[PDB]
């Protein structure tokens, strides 16, 4: 049986697949054509159907897992297309213990059981996130750091991505930005809590963008936002005060009211779709950073790691988060990021396989 | 000189006016026609021009202030129309010490000084809020409680507005929902801090609503929202899990992703403008309640009072706030509201008049 871990989220399915590379001669005889066909299909394609993608650059090579050497692969596709995945799974010449997490492990349990003799084991979506994150960081990204930060995030001429060491990772605030946001306080390998969450997450960015701009993809939304000026939509401190609000240390450039200039008909008429995309991104990202900061201060944790796919190919939000956390905490908190940010739940699920 | 206090916000100007009612015979001789004309104009009209409104139901009658008996009046108009107000102020037969707060006391300082021999004294917008709130509560609302809560906010068949006693008001978390949000921790009459704020406030509700629905007023936006179903736009916990997320006590009805269903083209095509208005209101209100709760827990304050004009004629948001704070704090925090919620800064400004 192939070794998969699966995180079925509200928006995306993430799949970790361990490809053995130490297959012997007698081991290839004792394996069925369908097992060979699935291994060949997964490793010889980087697009699967019309919406599946293997993130080739994330592959972990020559990993020893469960006493075998192999490569760990990272694949994603829309949860909306899970029926197609399950149909392909029921197809002839494919007849497995599947560790699954995320909400969809429960919602689609009965659908996975249409695959004959498949054994589905549901695991908790935040327990899998924790052990996946700790595992990838422990094995490294092919010898490079899994974790990084933006050095000198206050100065743009200096702000550069730099590796960050998490060899003693506790305590840790994990901010999981998916469709919504979950915020976790990790005190040990076996001691963590969901301290809170927010419903203003990646799905809010994509949903509002689509309504406001007509964009048809996450990437198109980000490309619109990169061209925009959020201050066309947002009311700033200087629009209210005429400059800084000195008494409480609020700089004139801080957003006083997100989309607050859109109360004026003449401004709604002059704002561009790119401006609205950028205002949506800034609004969502700042609120996440602000909630993360309050949780860090309350939990007394100074390391905040942001994960989830809201941040993939999204350097705008990452830099905004890095700069904001540093500025508003007056340097007391650091924003940390992880190369495998969207996949930790899927890896954690795969790690539960020995328990079955 | 008439006794005014003025709070010039990013969206609305609030004006408190003290009308003396113990004017003697010899006092009426020694007063100028312009002073008489302004008193008559203010007390004989409830609409001023096309956008000024006197909130007659809020009037405090037979108040003793600065050793005089009179009535305290509450008037509001859009900051956008302040040029008209200043022009009327420069008009002949109107030729005052004006205590002003809010950002616009600084932004429009030079404009107020076009009124000859007017003396403008700027006061801080949150210091004025505190002393105004404490003062109105101390004098009562014509003998009724200024402060109220929604009893049994978890049960709708029982949930009713009830008076709340703030005779010993400290400590207190004050959540000021204007264009944006400021959150204050009040420990004594002279000891308070702005613990944080959020840029997702009343101007976000009105701005996003106008973009999403075409509504042209705050009241039209609220009326649209009252007819809508936010779950048409929002992705709920049960849309992701199929039911409750038991492990972390998240009910199926909780919003997992605000506007998160709008990532699907077919749902954007079926959602109504009323649904989007309601989703905007729920998103803004829940985020405010959530931020207020984190601040209360961190500050160790169990009384949270919500003020600002986002909540005027807005019982939907008030009940949402009451229910949410009670539910998510498991009954440890109570949402408190104030009858004069939009005007405390203007009253605080007026109270600074003796210092000049
Ligand atoms: N190709 C993509 N398609 C859709 N959303 C994308 C894509 N790439 C990035 N995103 C963003 O990533 C978010 C989904 O992140 P993800 O961590 O996979 O959440 P999820 O697990 O599907 N949801 P959840 O149930 O809340 O944990 C979306 O809301 C988008 O903001
Ligand atoms: N007639 C109205 N016109 C505009 N907004 C209204 C009106 N009635 C209620 N509101 C709401 O009340 C909000 C303004 O509240 P308010 O407390 O007066 O803020 P402000 O002082 O003008 N802004 P700020 O500079 O942040 O303190 C608006 O954003 C709307 O959500
Ligand atoms: C429980 C928290 C805090 N909520 C409030 C609301 C009002 C108040 Cl007064 N307090 N808290 C708002 C919603 N929440 C969330 O976690 C939303 C949420 C749930 C579930 C997910 C992921 C799918 C797992 C992602 C996101
Ligand atoms: C300083 C706070 C917190 N901000 C962040 C952002 C990122 C991070 Cl990481 N942390 N905090 C977001 C903005 N803020 C505000 O107060 C916004 C704000 C300013 C001013 C007003 C009123 C006009 C007085 C109303 C509202
Ligand atoms: Mg997820
Ligand atoms: Mg204000």
Curated annotation (Swiss-Prot), chains A, B:
EC numbers, comma separated: 2.7.1.33
Pathway entry: Cofactor biosynthesis; coenzyme A biosynthesis; CoA from (R)-pantothenate: step 1/5
GO biological process, one term: coenzyme A biosynthetic process
One Pfam family per UniProt: Fumble
Catalyzed reactions per annotation: (R)-pantothenate + ATP = (R)-4'-phosphopantothenate + ADP + H(+)
Cellular location(s): Cytoplasm
Effect of mutating residue 9 to V: Loss of catalytic activity
Tissue: Highly expressed in the liver.
Effect of residue 256 to F: Loss of catalytic activity but can bind ATP normally
InterPro entries: ATPase_NBD, Type_II_PanK
Coiled coil: none
Binding site for acetyl-CoA: 179, 182, 194
Family annotation (SUPFAM superfamilies): Actin-like ATPase domain
Residue positions of the active site: 125 (proton acceptor)
Top-rank EC class of the record's enzyme: transferase
Regulation: Subject to allosteric regulation, exists in two distinct conformational states, a catalytically incompetent (or open) conformation stabilized by the binding of acetyl(acyl)-CoA, and a catalytically competent (or closed) conformation stabilized by ATP-binding. Inhibited by acetyl-CoA and its thioesters which act as allosteric inhibitors and compete with the ATP-binding site. Inhibited by sulfonylureas and thiazolidinediones. Activated by oleoylethanolamide, palmitoyl-carnitine and oleoyl-carnitine.
Effect of mutating residue 194 to A: Loss of catalytic activity
Outcome following mutation: residue 254 to F: Loss of catalytic activity but can bind ATP normally
Any GO CC annotation of this UniProt entry: nucleus
Coarse class of the protein's main subcellular location: cytoplasm
Quaternary state and interactors: Homodimer.
Family indicated by similarity: Belongs to the type II pantothenate kinase family.
Summary of the function given for this chain in its UniProt record: Catalyzes the phosphorylation of pantothenate to generate 4'-phosphopantothenate in the first and rate-determining step of coenzyme A (CoA) synthesis.
Protein name: Pantothenate kinase 3
Source organism (scientific name): Homo sapiens
């Amino acid at each position: 049986s192939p070794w998969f871990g699966m995180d079925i989220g509200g928006t995306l399915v993430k799949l970790s697949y361990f490809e053995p590379i130490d297959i012997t001669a007698e081991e290839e005889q004792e394996e069925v054509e369908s097992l060979k066909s699935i291994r060949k299909y997964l490793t010889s394609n980087v697009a699967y159907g019309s919406t599946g993608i293997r993130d080739v650059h994330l592959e972990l090579k020559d990993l020893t897992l469960f006493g075998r050497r192999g490569n760990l692969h990272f694949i994603r596709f829309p949860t909306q297309d899970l029926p197609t995945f399950i149909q392909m799974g029921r197809d002839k010449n494919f007849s497995t213990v599947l560790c699954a997490t995320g909400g969809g492990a429960y919602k689609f349990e009965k659908d996975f059981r249409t695959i004959g003799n498949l054994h589905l084991h549901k695991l908790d979506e935040l327990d899998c996130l924790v052990k996946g994150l700790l595992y990838i960081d422990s094995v490294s990204f092919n010898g490079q750091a899994e974790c990084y930060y933006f050095a000198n995030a206050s100065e743009p001429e200096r702000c550069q991505k730099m590796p960050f060491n998490l060899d003693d990772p506790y305590p840790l605030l994990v901010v999981n930005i998916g469709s919504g946001v979950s915020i976790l306080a990790v005190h040990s390998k076996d001691n963590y809590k969901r301290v809170t969450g927010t419903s203003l997450g990646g799905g809010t960015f994509l949903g509002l963008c689509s309504l406001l701009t007509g964009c048809e993809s996450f990437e198109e939304a980000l490309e619109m936002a990169s061209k925009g000026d959020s201050t066309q939509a947002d009311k700033l401190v200087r629009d209210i005060y005429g400059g800084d609000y000195e008494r409480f240390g609020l700089p004139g450039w801080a957003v006083a009211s997100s989309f607050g200039n859109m109360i004026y008909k003449e401004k709604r008429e002059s704002v561009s779709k790119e401006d609205l995309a950028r205002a949506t991104l800034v609004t969502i990202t700042n609120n996440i950073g602000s909630v993360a900061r309050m949780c860090a201060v309350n939990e007394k944790i100074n390391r905040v790691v942001f994960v989830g796919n809201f941040l993939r190919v999204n350097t705008l939000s990452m830099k905004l988060l890095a700069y904001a956390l540093d500025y508003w905490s007056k340097g007391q908190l650091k924003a940390l990021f992880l190369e495998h940010e969207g996949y930790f739940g899927a890896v954690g699920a795969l790690l539960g396989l020995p328990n079955f």
